[PDB]
Symmetry: D4
Subunit: 70 residues, 8 copies
């Protein structure tokens, strides 16, 4: 789990987190993201940041929080 | 130049370009970028996008134009 | 042409046009849209409105104007 | 009911739900919607989405929750 | 006329004009307003301001210009 | 008390309540507002609505909720 | 003239200029501001920046541009 | 401490606090601020306000709480 279960449970690669609450330009991982390094690097390659969001869907601003450690 | 002159004449690396207008999460280039390949190459080294923005200052959101050549 | 050439030249089906300038939740037609009726009905079926936008890309808010007649 | 009770207890048809929070371009239901199939059926007849919102008023954006059953 | 012609050529009563640009909480005039005294007189009968806006539709925020004569 | 004690405790006359949370164009009562009618009418005369806000200060958007009954 | 005549002609001391277009928390000079230094220092004392705005009125966000030199 | 602990536990100097929530145009303190008089004294030396914010990072707007003691 790179994201907690529950609310912010859906890991997405997003350009930025506005106000640390709004994940903007989010698109879902293309590989399997089972650790924080995997998640992070997979996003920093896409020119995205690793976020955990309230829905698994991609493009459309939505609530997110950053992945821990990162 | 990798930016026009006149209004949008400052290269900055930004996370995204909201509405294609507003540059968010930008940084001043740290190297000298004089081609479009080098610009987005220096920005990708940040997960950033090459933009052309109304000012040299990177703190506080800005009016930005997507870089040409990228 | 359901959209003018030039700036607002890219026909998209979008949930709404904020301030008559910002097309929100936009996704591109799935069929061929060669008249205003075709364009319109194709969008009203997707629960979208027909807009003409400054880019052919889908999800990400962007500048748009409504299609004429509609 | 097709909405909870408490806070988000008003069915309204809206174009979209910005951030999953803000209902935009909403209308008061014109028919009586007492199942979730009927609700989004009455909304789709507008290109709208069934939402559950903090008030009965449809003019001015609102805090809204996606309908359950839709 | 109590509005110009061209762009801002629709009188509407609105609660305020955000940034002097965005008309918020507007209503269609219910009476015929053909002087500037009568316009803000018909709007004040709502706690509203007389504005001149880009469209006749009052649902959804709008680009508006403060009325002249008021 | 036209406003609850605590958070939304400061009665202001405001042009509108954005998203039912943000009181915009707020200016403080010029008379004494000791009942809901007094509060309300005093605002509807100023072309404002009666709101209860998180601070007694006037011009600057701030969190508010509508006065009860009104 | 610390501000041009015409559009951005009204000198105000404002907390910040959002997107270099929106003067936020603006209040008018308390002394006479006849040069750029006078204007600037008078604002930097109020914890404001010197801006030139489209109206002489204080509190309410409005279009502004920074004073030259500063 | 000049900030609480828990959520809003980072002192930053910011131009304003939009809605009393969003800290805009902030900077990291450059000196050590351990009283409330010293904090707004170090911020006023910038035309800034002492705020207590959810993170140590000052680039990109933030959730902030007005400083207590100021
Ligand atoms: C209006 C549509 C924008 C896309 C068209 C191409 C750029 C136009 C630049 C406008 C002038 C400002 O540009 S600048 O060259 O002065 O920096
Ligand atoms: C906080 C996460 C939101 C998704 C969880 C499910 C809805 C929670 C409703 C919160 C209370 C308000 O709802 S209501 O039942 O009172 O109308
Ligand atoms: C740009 C500054 C605005 C204030 C100046 C006076 C109004 C200018 C109207 C611009 C054209 C649109 O107006 S309209 O007459 O076509 O409706
Ligand atoms: C909700 C109203 C806000 C004003 C009341 C006083 C501050 C409340 C802090 C909420 C918890 C977060 O604060 S913190 O101590 O954890 O940083």
């Amino acid at each position: 789990a790179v994201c907690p279960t529950g609310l912010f449970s859906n890991p997405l690669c997003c350009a930025t987190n506005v106000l640390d609450l709004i994940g903007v330009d989010c698109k879902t991982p293309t590989i399997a993201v089972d650790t924080g390094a995997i998640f992070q690097a997979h996003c920093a390659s896409k020119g995205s940041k690793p976020l955990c969001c309230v829905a698994p869907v991609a493009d459309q601003a939505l609530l997110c929080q950053k992945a821990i450690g990162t």
